[PDB]
Each structure stands twice: as structure tokens, then as C-alpha cells.
Amino acid sequence: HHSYTWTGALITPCAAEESKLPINALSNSLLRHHNMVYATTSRSAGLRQKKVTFDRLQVLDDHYRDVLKEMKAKASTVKAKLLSVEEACKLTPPHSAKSKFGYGAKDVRNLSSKAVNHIHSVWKDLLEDTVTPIDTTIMAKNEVFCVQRKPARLIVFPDLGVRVCEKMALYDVVSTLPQVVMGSSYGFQYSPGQRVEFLVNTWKSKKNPMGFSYDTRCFDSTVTENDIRVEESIYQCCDLAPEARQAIKSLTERLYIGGPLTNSKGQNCGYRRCRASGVLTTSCGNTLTCYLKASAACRAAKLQDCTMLVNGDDLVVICESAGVQEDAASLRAFTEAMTRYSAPPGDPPQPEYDLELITSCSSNVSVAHDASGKRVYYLTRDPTTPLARAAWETARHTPVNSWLGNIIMYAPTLWARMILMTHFFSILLAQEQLEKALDCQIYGACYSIEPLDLPQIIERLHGLSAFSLHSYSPGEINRVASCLRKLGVPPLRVWRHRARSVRARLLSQGGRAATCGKYLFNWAVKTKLKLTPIPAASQLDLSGWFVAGYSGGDIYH
Ligand SMILES: CC(C)N(c1cc(C#CC(C)(C)C)sc1C(=O)O)C(=O)[C@H]1CC[C@H](C)CC1
């Protein structure tokens, strides 16, 4: 029951790869310690292969089957529909990897005859053959980090034609099923502010709360054939068209359970028998399987009143404390059960009695104060990776602008406001690119966003308090400060001056640009304006932004 087997052929790049942080004339304005930033490359793929390759054992007990039955009962209330070819085509990102069969993402999006004809042939083949494993490509991801180096993560994905078919069969299911099965525990239904609200309300709902995060070691590799078939059994509980049932069975047998791995050069690299990281069902399947295992483990451990919050392989549990000693023992039992279910821990979980000390989805709840002095809870994170990626993006145009996604998701934070907003608006001004739409990712889905729309987006997501937060926590201030020292980022006085300059220039432009100046940089001036609701904010169609997770699922909006 190996997660992978390997032929010895290398995982190869499909283009030139850089590992060292590229530098231009703008780099120093953000950070001086350039050697601390690196990107992963295929050169480290072998190290990753070694980490992700291991035998899985699974012992499934009555708690597991009990929880599964309950999940299936909820799933049976879901009705899901097939997407049309056109609907599925329109969800394809403009720069998604081209097919090996003579067409690309633009052809798909334009409903070209060649592309649509091929998609039809793939769909027909799915209905007629439920056995033959479908080819996948394995690649080493190029991702940017700060030292202390990680080996490249791997991505495994089927051809463009297949991806469109996955959407047709499964887009409605993976968008709808998780919240029905998991209710308030499904993390992707929340904006950051809503996630904070759920965490705080859950913490407050306990008489004596205790909470912990649980990090499964290499989660995708721990997912077994059993788990993937159990996932299919949950999808099949839905009210589906018979054609959809067949396509779902077929994709499960031929793609989700496993298949051959082919490198960028067309050589056979080996064989996968665990979760593929680059299929439509990666996020939903991981979320369901993590929730199933954790819920059963809570019962095995006799944790009291467990409330889960699950986002793919990311897990937070908040429960009723039974005492420090009892809590620590129950957590060990929980871990032993997760391990039996094939979800052993990377780092051992630890009980926390302060909500702000639990880190999940790389984030934590913190507190600051609004203009009226009231306490506001908001979502933050360690800014190291955001700033490292920001430095790379300062010198190179990249397919996904992490800086933009980070401003959107972390708008209320000390670091996103002081540094990211100031730095990138300065750059946009200089190049007169304020109006140019840019791609970013939210919960794995790709969105094209104009930076001039940021104040409205931020108001809709976080409320007006996002523009007035101050008196951040000492813990949060200290964490930011340490990061700035580590990377060699300029001090607050510098950022405040740059912000006043950016603000002034934005104001003189009028229109949305002036709105950006007024709202984003009100923190930087001596005499603060009293900010009021932006009229055009309600016009944004944000329905669909925080419904589901789509990491690896090739989704665009
Ligand atoms: C106390 C005051 C000087 N002040 C401030 C500075 C901090 C720091 C710092 C570092 C040491 C990390 C540089 S923390 C903090 C606060 O209000 O808690 C602010 O007006 C902040 C400035 C930045 C904007 C975006 C939000 C308001």
C-alpha cells in the first residue's frame, strides 16, 4: 500500500527555473536581506519524492463507520446538476495548461470546435470505460519562501480535456456538498472576518474552552484507496443524473484513486495510489476525509463537545475542557486514533487555552481597536512568506499576484496595510497601472481583480473598521517587528512617509484612485478623515467568493 512507486526517471521542468531572488531598482525599498528569499525548483524534487513515499496502514473501527453513516445521511439531501460544456469551459483559467491534443485554455474559453469536440470525446470515453487509468503529469511547483530550505512541493494533474469534464460532472457537487455535510464546520464558506466570528463564537460557546490545531504529515500521501472510494460513496448519496453517476464512478476509478505519473518530457515517472494534488476534488475530498477522520477520533478520544473547523487538510478543534491533565491525555488519544485512520501528525498537537494562540490555515485570531476604541477581532498571520513573495513579485511578473490576494484576505492587519498597500500602490502609480486587472487566488480559485476596486472589496469583506484599526496586540506587533528585522524591511517612519506621498498622488487623480488614497492610507496622516460607506461597494458581485475551496482544481472567475 505504497503512496507512490517510482521508475527512476526525473521530475523535469517545463521551463527555465530561478531559485535566487531576482533584484531590480525597487527591491531595496521593500527589503535588504535578499539572500533570505528563495524559490523551490525541480532540483529538489527527489527530496520531496522521498518524503511523500511511504506505506499506509488503516484500521477502521465503529466510530469511523458511525460518523460516515451520519455524513452520508446529510449528503443524501443534496441535489446536484451537470454543468454544460459551455459552463465548464467558462470556469477554465485563461492561462491554464494547454491540452496535449492540439488546443489551449483560450480555445476552451472561446468554445472552439477543436476544443469542444475533444471534450465531448473525453466525456464519452468516461461513460464507456470505467477501468483504464488516466494519464497525469507530475511537476515540481516553483514557490517562494524565506529560509528557515524546503524541497519543492509536487503537483499532479490530468490533461485539460479531462479537467473540463471534471467540472461538468463535479463542480456543483464540490461547491454544494461540503457545507451540507459539515455545516458550520466547513471552513471555505467563510470570509476571513466570518471565520474569526465563528472561532470566537465557538470559543465563547464553551464553559471552559480548549482548542488545538492538528497538522497531518503530508496529508495527500496519507489518503488511501479506501478513503477515495469512501469519498465517492458520499458523492453518490447526492440526487444526481444517471449520466453524472457514471462519470463520477469513472473519474474515481480512473483518476482519483490513482494512475501513472508522466514528466514534462513524456517519460513514465511512476505510479500514484494517493490523492492527486491537482484535480477538482482535491479540496472537497481532503475536507471530507479530514472531517470524517477527526470526528471519529474525537469520539474515540472522548473529547467533550468537539466543534471542528476544517479547510482541506487544515484542522482546528475547539471543545469543552476536562482539566489540563485530562485534556492532554485526550489529545494523545485523538492522535493515536488519527494515526490508526492513516492521518499521523507532523508536529504533535498541543492544547491551547488562549484562542489567539491557535494557528490554523497559517492564521490566527488577534485583536485591535477601531476608531471608536472598541475591540475588534480580525484574522492575521506571520508576514514572512507574504513579504518574501512580495519581494519576488516586485522584480518579476508572475501568474498569481500573492500581494493582491494577501491585501484582500489580510486587509485589517498591521503588515498588509503598512507595507503591502504602500509598496504596491507606489509601484502601480509609477507605471500608471492602477486600472490593470491582475490575477490572484482566493481559497485556490483564480480571480481577475482591478486594484482600484480594493477599497470597496475590503469594505464588503471586512467592514469600515479595516481602515481604522490601531492599538494592535503586543504579540502581533512583536511578530511583525521581528519579521521586518529578519528580512531587512524599512521602519515605520519610512512607510508612513511613502504612504503620505502615495495618498497625495492618488487623491489628485479623483475617481476610484482618490477613494484608494482616502481609505487605504487614512492611517498615515496626522488629521484622520472620518470614513464613510462607499456607494459603489454594493455593486460588486461577491456571491461565489467564499462558498467553497478549489485548491488545485483549475477554477477561474
Ligand atoms: C502606535 C502607532 C504609532 N501605530 C502603530 C505602529 C505599530 C508598529 C510597528 C512596527 C514595530 C511593527 C514597525 S503598531 C501601532 C498601533 O496602533 O498598534 C499606528 O498608528 C499604526 C501605524 C500603521 C497603520 C497600518 C496602523 C496604525
Swiss-Prot record:
What does changing residue 281 to V do?
Almost complete loss of RdRp activity
**What happens upon changing residue 314 to H?**
Complete loss of RdRp activity
Q: Where in the cell is it found?
A: Host cytoplasm; Host endoplasmic reticulum membrane
Give the result of residue 312 to A/C, as annotated.
Almost complete loss of RdRp activity
Q: Where is the RdRp catalytic domain?
A: 209-327
Entry comment on modification after translation:
The N-terminus is phosphorylated by host PRK2/PKN2.
Q: How is the cofactor bound?
A: Binds 2 magnesium ion that constitute a dinuclear catalytic metal center.
Q: Which cofactor does it need?
A: Mg(2+)
Q: What is its quaternary makeup?
A: Homooligomer. Interacts with non-structural protein 5A. Interacts with host VAPB. Interacts with host PRK2/PKN2. Interacts with host HNRNPA1 and SEPT6; these interactions facilitate the viral replication. Part of the replication complex composed of NS2, NS3, NS4A, NS4B, NS5A and the RNA-directed RNA polymerase embedded in an ER-derived membranous web.
Q: What does this protein do?
A: RNA-dependent RNA polymerase that performs primer-template recognition and RNA synthesis during viral replication. Initiates RNA transcription/replication at a flavin adenine dinucleotide (FAD), resulting in a 5'- FAD cap on viral RNAs. In this way, recognition of viral 5' RNA by host pattern recognition receptors can be bypassed, thereby evading activation of antiviral pathways.
UniProt-recorded name of the protein = RNA-directed RNA polymerase
Originating species: Hepatitis C virus genotype 1b (isolate BK)
What residues of the intact protein does this structure contain? 2422 to 2981 of 3010
